[PDB]
């Protein structure tokens, strides 16, 4: 919304668009550094004002919410590497 100083909603249908073009990097951008990849988002704007190319992104934060929200329903979602052993997309901050 203009009054909140909004962002433009890039919807399912816009994602399709980029998909059909095959602009993987432009879409990914939309889905990480331009929206909620808090790490690479902060990382990017620092890269521009420093005159550097933007950095390859990490996992969007809204996906993490999707994990934690499936735990709260007692479902154990799990990122895994090709050799089937888990991968912490929380960098140890939720293990003891």
């Amino acid at each position: 919304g203009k009054a909140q100083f909004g962002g433009q909603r890039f919807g399912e249908m816009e994602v399709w668009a980029l998909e059909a073009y095959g602009a993987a990097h432009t879409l990914q951008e939309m889905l990480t550094l331009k929206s909620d990849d808090i790490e690479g988002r902060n990382a990017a704007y620092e890269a521009i004002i420093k005159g550097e190319d933007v950095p390859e992104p990490s996992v969007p934060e809204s996906f993490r919410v999707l994990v934690k929200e499936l735990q709260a329903l007692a479902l154990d979602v799990q990122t895994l590497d090709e050799k089937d052993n888990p991968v912490d997309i929380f960098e140890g901050l939720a293990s003891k």
Binding site: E12, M30, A72
Partner: protein, 243 residues
Amino acid sequence: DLVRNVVRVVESYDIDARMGAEAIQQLLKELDLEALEKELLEEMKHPSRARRAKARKRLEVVRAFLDSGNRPEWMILEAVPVLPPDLRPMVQVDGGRFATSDLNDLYRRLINRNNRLKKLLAQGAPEIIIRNEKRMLQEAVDALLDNGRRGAPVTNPGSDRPLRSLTDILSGKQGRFRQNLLGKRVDYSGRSVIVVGPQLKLHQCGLPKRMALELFKPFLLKKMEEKGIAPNVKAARRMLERQ
């Protein structure tokens, strides 16, 4: 009896007959999955195709558990999990007033009933009462997770708005998938009224310059240095903040 000095015996058995998730976690726990496979196929041999049909449906679910390693009993929680606070916050809005997720009022709702049952236990209350606390306990947990799915939906007082339960968050056009994973909002974007420019070449467009500035604001801060309309980027920003 000490007045009649008789020892009375009332005709009645030591039967074990229970109620609710307490029961079922047992029956699920006493399921030798391999066994039931054996019988269901050993019955997949039947004619009339109607028995053969549902021993497939059922058997599918057995092997679903066998192949994965899940235990059937696990579809009954003893420990219900709680979702980190920040994902269901309590916030002071501008007026120092607070805005809170629907989940707290759903948890609280459940935490009371679990608590008041932990008490009703030790104070030894009749079944007819402990029964009602347990029932009320499912409907608690059944509304935290999928409010309105079964029975009436959990309404805050003075409104008729169903509270937003965990499944309601996950699902729907407004849910987490379709509204935040298959497409978000974005930085570096603008909107405006369009207008024909017949002077453009095919590959061009008319971007008003006020929009331009913002959509490129980082880039403009760095350039603004490399020439020097400001000393460093931070002062560069404070220039463009008033017109």
